[PDB]
Scaffold this active site. Sequence first.
Site, PDB file in Angstrom:
ATOM      1  CE  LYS A  33      -4.338  -1.893   1.318  1.00 37.27           C
ATOM      2  NZ  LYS A  33      -4.521  -1.873   0.530  1.00 37.27           N
ATOM      3  CG  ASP A  53      -4.398  -0.850  -3.111  1.00 36.29           C
ATOM      4  OD1 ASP A  53      -4.332   0.217  -3.710  1.00 36.29           O
ATOM      5  OD2 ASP A  53      -5.026  -1.980  -3.021  1.00 36.29           O
ATOM      6  CG  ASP A 108      -9.969  -2.342  -3.991  1.00 43.26           C
ATOM      7  OD1 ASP A 108     -10.823  -2.874  -4.241  1.00 43.26           O
ATOM      8  OD2 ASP A 108      -8.441  -2.713  -2.898  1.00 43.26           O
ATOM      9  CD  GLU A 117      -5.491  -3.660  -5.435  1.00 45.63           C
ATOM     10  OE1 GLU A 117      -3.917  -4.000  -5.598  1.00 45.63           O
ATOM     11  OE2 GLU A 117      -6.350  -3.336  -4.730  1.00 45.63           O
ATOM     12  CD1 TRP A 147      -4.928  -9.648   2.034  1.00 47.53           C
ATOM     13  CD2 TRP A 147      -7.166  -8.894   3.555  1.00 47.53           C
ATOM     14  NE1 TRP A 147      -4.616  -8.774   3.910  1.00 47.53           N
ATOM     15  CE2 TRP A 147      -6.081  -8.647   4.131  1.00 47.53           C
ATOM     16  CE3 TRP A 147      -8.271  -9.283   3.823  1.00 47.53           C
ATOM     17  CZ2 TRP A 147      -5.863  -7.878   5.411  1.00 47.53           C
ATOM     18  CZ3 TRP A 147      -9.412  -8.175   4.783  1.00 47.53           C
ATOM     19  CH2 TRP A 147      -7.544  -7.761   5.898  1.00 47.53           C
ATOM     20  CE  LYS A 188     -11.464  -3.833   0.156  1.00 44.37           C
ATOM     21  NZ  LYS A 188     -10.436  -4.108  -1.332  1.00 44.37           N
ATOM     22  CB  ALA A 192     -13.485  -3.614   3.574  1.00 46.00           C
TER      23      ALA A 192
HETATM   24  C1  LIG Z   1      -5.934  -5.343   1.429  1.00 42.64           C
HETATM   25  N1  LIG Z   1      -6.855  -5.356   1.186  1.00 42.64           N
HETATM   26  C2  LIG Z   1      -7.636  -6.156   0.644  1.00 42.64           C
HETATM   27  C3  LIG Z   1      -7.749  -5.090   2.600  1.00 42.64           C
HETATM   28  C4  LIG Z   1      -8.444  -3.713   2.606  1.00 42.64           C
HETATM   29  C5  LIG Z   1      -8.385  -2.749   1.076  1.00 42.64           C
HETATM   30  C6  LIG Z   1      -7.891  -3.759   0.346  1.00 42.64           C
HETATM   31  C7  LIG Z   1      -6.745  -3.551  -0.852  1.00 42.64           C
HETATM   32  O1  LIG Z   1      -7.300  -1.971  -1.075  1.00 42.64           O
HETATM   33  O2  LIG Z   1      -6.966  -3.765  -1.586  1.00 42.64           O
HETATM   34 MG   LIG Z   2      -6.842  -2.565  -3.000  1.00 43.17          MG
END
Ligand SMILES: C[N+]1(C)CCC[C@H]1C(=O)O
Ligand SMILES: [Mg+2]
Lengths: 369, 369, 369, 369
Positions: free
Chosen positions: D164, D194, D242, D219, D321, D266, D295
């Site tokens: 992230k 991401d 996403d 992403e 995930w 998701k 989430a």
């Molecule tokens: C890592 N995740 C799968 C969990 C929370 C956000 C999300 C994602 O943005 O890819």
């Molecule tokens: Mg994401």
Amino acid sequence: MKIAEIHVYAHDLPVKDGPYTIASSTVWSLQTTLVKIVADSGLAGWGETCPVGPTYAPSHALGARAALAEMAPGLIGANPLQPLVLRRRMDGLLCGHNYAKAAIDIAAYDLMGKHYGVRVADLLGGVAAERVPSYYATGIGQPDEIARIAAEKVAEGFPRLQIKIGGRPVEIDIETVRKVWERIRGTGTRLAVDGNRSLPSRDALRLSRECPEIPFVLEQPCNTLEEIAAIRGRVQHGIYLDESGEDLSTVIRAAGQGLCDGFGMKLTRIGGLQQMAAFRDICEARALPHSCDDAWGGDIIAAACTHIGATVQPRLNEGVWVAQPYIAQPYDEENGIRIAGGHIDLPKGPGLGITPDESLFGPPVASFS
Amino acid sequence: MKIAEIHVYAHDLPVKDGPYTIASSTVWSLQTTLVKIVADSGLAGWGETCPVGPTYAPSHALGARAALAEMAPGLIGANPLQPLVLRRRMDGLLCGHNYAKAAIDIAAYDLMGKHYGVRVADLLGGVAAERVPSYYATGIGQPDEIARIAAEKVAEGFPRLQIKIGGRPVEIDIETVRKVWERIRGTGTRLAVDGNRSLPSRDALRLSRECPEIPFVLEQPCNTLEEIAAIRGRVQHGIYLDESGEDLSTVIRAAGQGLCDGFGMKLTRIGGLQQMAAFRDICEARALPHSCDDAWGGDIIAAACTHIGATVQPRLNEGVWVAQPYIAQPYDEENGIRIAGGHIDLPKGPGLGITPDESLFGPPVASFS
Amino acid sequence: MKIAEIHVYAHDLPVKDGPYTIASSTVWSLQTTLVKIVADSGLAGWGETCPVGPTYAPSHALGARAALAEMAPGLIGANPLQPLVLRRRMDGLLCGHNYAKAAIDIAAYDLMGKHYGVRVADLLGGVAAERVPSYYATGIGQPDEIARIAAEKVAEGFPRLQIKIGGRPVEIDIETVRKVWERIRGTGTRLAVDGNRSLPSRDALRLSRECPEIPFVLEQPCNTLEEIAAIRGRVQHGIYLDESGEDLSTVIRAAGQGLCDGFGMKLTRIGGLQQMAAFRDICEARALPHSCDDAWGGDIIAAACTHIGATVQPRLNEGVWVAQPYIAQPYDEENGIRIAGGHIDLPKGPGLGITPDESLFGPPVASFS
Amino acid sequence: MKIAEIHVYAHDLPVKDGPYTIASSTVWSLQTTLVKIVADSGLAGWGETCPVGPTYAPSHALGARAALAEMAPGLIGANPLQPLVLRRRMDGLLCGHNYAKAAIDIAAYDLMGKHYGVRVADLLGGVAAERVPSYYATGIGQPDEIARIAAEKVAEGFPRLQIKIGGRPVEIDIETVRKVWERIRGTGTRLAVDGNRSLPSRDALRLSRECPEIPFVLEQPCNTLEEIAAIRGRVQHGIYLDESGEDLSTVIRAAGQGLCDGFGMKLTRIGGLQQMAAFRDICEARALPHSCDDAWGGDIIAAACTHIGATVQPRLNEGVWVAQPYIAQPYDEENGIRIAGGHIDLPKGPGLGITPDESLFGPPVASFS
Ligand SMILES: C[N+]1(C)CCC[C@H]1C(=O)O
Ligand SMILES: [Mg+2]
Ligand SMILES: C[N+]1(C)CCC[C@H]1C(=O)O
Ligand SMILES: C[N+]1(C)CCC[C@H]1C(=O)O
Ligand SMILES: C[N+]1(C)CCC[C@H]1C(=O)O
Ligand SMILES: [Mg+2]
Ligand SMILES: [Mg+2]
Ligand SMILES: [Mg+2]
Ligand SMILES: [Mg+2]
Ligand SMILES: [Mg+2]
Ligand SMILES: [Mg+2]
Ligand SMILES: [Mg+2]
Ligand SMILES: [Mg+2]
Ligand SMILES: [Mg+2]
């Protein structure tokens, strides 16, 4: 002149030192289908269609024979000297199934050439080259192994190599491409990298992005033309279509909308020599290089590919691929198609220039009169 | 076989009941150019090219002869039985000038047919119809006079009419279209309206917008393909290209990008029978109806147009236009091309099926050996 | 659970009051192919595929049987309760041939429903309606005769009519459409006009342009999706795809790029119920009305179409077409699919709700274990 | 069968070693919402929805409970064995709010599986893999720290890492990406970066431009799909959606127009398993790799994600995930979802294979009968 008889034959082709591994099809032996058309006069022409396993394309040996069985009764009495009229007659009996129609188309051109005393290439516009380039296509394998084979085949005389990739993590494909390039750079050999419908756009993007200094064309990297059209603007290597080029209409879309930079084209897929000649003319108008190949098969399909190949403008000719190196027994011991020095000599005789030994095939599996 | 001699002829053809008025060209007489190719064997083939005045297209009689004189020395010794190889050889001697190249192409096909004992249509894929439809093209004139002529030609048997318009206020063109339709509606006669490059988009839009109930196709309404592409989405009548269809590349753009719904195609413009066959195959793949015409000319060019026309799928054949009704003296009084009942019977003999009275042509203006 | 046996059957179905004329296919009798899958437990499921003649689509009876013979040995031992896993396994044995794969898919769903004691529609998301609308498709014929038949079928209770056109001068098609509308206007009956791939863009444009006051959708007017995409902006009637909708990828292109306003969708073409459910979900997301049809066939394929049709949001359901009115002998005289009042009642039992009299089918043409 | 009762529970999930930092949401503890549906028979199914803070997406815990309170009375008496019919019923009670609808959808699939004695994956097409890959997602942190964690998680067995980024100068993100790549190159680990809606196009362009040799997919780099569509042609890395993938309609746009190369998807966002299965089928048709995530949340949502994940073609499965590593107390001590070796085993039991200990949740905060 009129078609009096149609005979369909089934014949096996074991892969020498097999298997041959394509990302979409692994093959150990191939079932070919031969067609003999006999005129009222007794004169005969031969055709052939041999899918490269039942998963490469929407075609298979049992399917070829079923399609020919459907069409044959409706073709008795037809004029085999009119390839376009004959194609329309086939369309009136069965929708699609180009790979089966092609065998009839080829047999009719063979017959026509024998009747007029002319080589098939000279019925398709004329011989532009007596010696036609071929290209060597490596099966999927280990990076160092494939690089070694690449060097070996360049030395044998092949002016172009196609490296098959896919079906595994793309970093292995990229390593293979880099190692091949290390061997063949400076030899003047042209390079194609064939994904055989197997790469997601994610991986096709990566392969091109990582290798700007390696001069491959990327052949059919993704499964659908839609995916290829989506990635094309983000890919700085030339992209060629193969499996997507299912008919003349698709070729017209691809050339007219600028969706590709060339083609690997298979004679049976496009529907025979009548359609292949039109394809050739479309590519020549737009300077789109292309090969004249088929999926697999012996002297009959190989000779058909060589004849159309001999008509292609030399600067656009990416080569004629034939399965001969993997086939132990030729149908025509004297004049069958043979690769020599990475090239193929056009047969001298009328028609396809091939006379198959029918005894090799056994009796027909189906006969129509 | 080899070309031993090439002979170029100038010949005049005055218009019966002239002049013939096209918005881009008014003509009282035409200068045609004939080509005779003689093989080593002594066998001869004939070709022809005849622009319809010097302002209709980028082509003219003096230019045709200049182009032929430029290419001829470089063609002595070439194999006349290989039309695509021959076309490439011509391209190596002179860029463009399709209208002149077409005359050589046609003579080669004539020679091939004579040599093999085959009709030219059968060398191009096969005779689909022994008798082909024609269409009558009206000159520009008074609305009620054109309507009267239209009715007369329908009664003669023409299955399609082309109404020429433009070069005057468009309200007169619209009145003409309406009056013609009043007389031919319910007869099953197809209608085309040909602007011959003369309508600004303003007027093309108006003609279609005002007449949704009249089933014409709008042929070459505007001068450039760019203008046509710009108006197409706002025009609910089918649009055909004529003058814009200058080569196979342009046809590929138009078909592949969906820029038109059909073609009025001239054999000399596209560069001869080899290219015309490819054009035909592109149109058939996309169900784009078309005619097989030329600008003008006698038995030789007319026969060439009729032969390719005879290979077209009947449902796509918008007709073969020939200048015969306006020509006093045929080249071949036994087998020459004639309209009968608004249709044309294909000649039955080998080659083009035409034996011109060569004496009619005068001595060659240029001879090469 | 595991597949223990697969049995392939050939069976004939002659057309009552035939022939049935489609612009692309005229048929006097149909050859259907049935598949029986037997589990280790002894429980059986049934599937069916029946092309409507060999020229309507790239599919034929002999081909269906060839494809099934190719795949069957590789399916013994597979879990029949996993339709997506089963589809992938089929893809690993044969490329394409959705029409044959669909028969296996349907038999698997039948088996699943029987095993769990659940109706197939409930396995696909749930019964939204116990009774689904159908539609009547007229053959090509004289305008006033078709108008009479249309009126009769509305009186029987059909909520929608499909008028087949093409293969003749379009003025006759337009007269047919106008005469049908004169008789059914004000009855709330929905109208579709099906060109079955046969109209050049010239004629599709004309049909829509001339009839803005007649509320048809234009179904598959032209042969290729490329032609349809080119004309769509100039056509103010909704356009539906039928034959062009060959797979889920094509549906994704059409919906995502806004290339059509709905679909006539055939279960066998898309590859079976697993894919059909996804298709349904795509259409529902974009409010694209569609039918759930097949080319032809008896109780087994009809029941499969009815089950998926029963899951469609009622406002989007253009109907389930079945060949039952043209078939003399039902497979299941107690529960077989029948049209009543222009609608179809869903069977009430587990699986497809159909128990075919297997004896009717003859011995299998091929059996695998 | 019919829904007799619906019970809504509120439950806290403290983040182990928190907080977890996303560019759009920093979380220390999470408020999950559980739903129990009880049939007339007494059989129960469980669902769950847990937004990852109220700023990640247009969803929040109080909002989930309000949406469920709105819908629940209108669902009493519904058939829980019909997931598509049930979804339409929910749409008839509340527009949007997929994240709440998903909890009902999941509980119904659980109930259905228990009733039929089948795993949820086998109601969605079938188990393609018993062991499902996961992926590890690093929170935003210092470059050297994140690189260390990346190496650690690769060693644990995760086949893919997501890093992230955002919310700070992009040069720090780029340093992080380079340092991570230095650790994981040569390990065969796939990489995603991401941006979580946080990069202006200026910075997304820079990140890709500077790092062609690093094989990440980018992403959701930008906030809107409009921004992503604008930069896509200038970015040579694959781009995944996403947050933008809010419904099936948007997925259809993205796939049909070629706007992305894959998805992080998701389950609660798309609206539940019925919609997720259709999403899966769309991606498989276009070879678009994707994950099956949510989430946040415990055993119930995790099991739902694992079940759909188990149906995905392995070559397209980017992983499932789950929040389990950050959750101290599982709902099902015996059979709850656990990551082991970077992968997740599919539960063996019917339905979701999970039996929550209700005593952990306290009494329902709302009950409907
Ligand atoms: C890592 N995740 C799968 C969990 C929370 C956000 C999300 C994602 O943005 O890819
Ligand atoms: Mg994401
Ligand atoms: C190498 N080939 C010509 C032979 C089989 C496949 C094909 C190709 O995909 O290019
Ligand atoms: C009718 N014509 C074939 C004759 C000369 C011009 C041409 C046309 O413009 O269509
Ligand atoms: C009406 N039908 C469903 C029956 C056979 C063909 C088809 C159609 O073209 O719509
Ligand atoms: Mg070399
Ligand atoms: Mg290839
Ligand atoms: Mg006989
Ligand atoms: Mg008439
Ligand atoms: Mg014109
Ligand atoms: Mg009614
Ligand atoms: Mg239809
Ligand atoms: Mg690993
Ligand atoms: Mg109660």
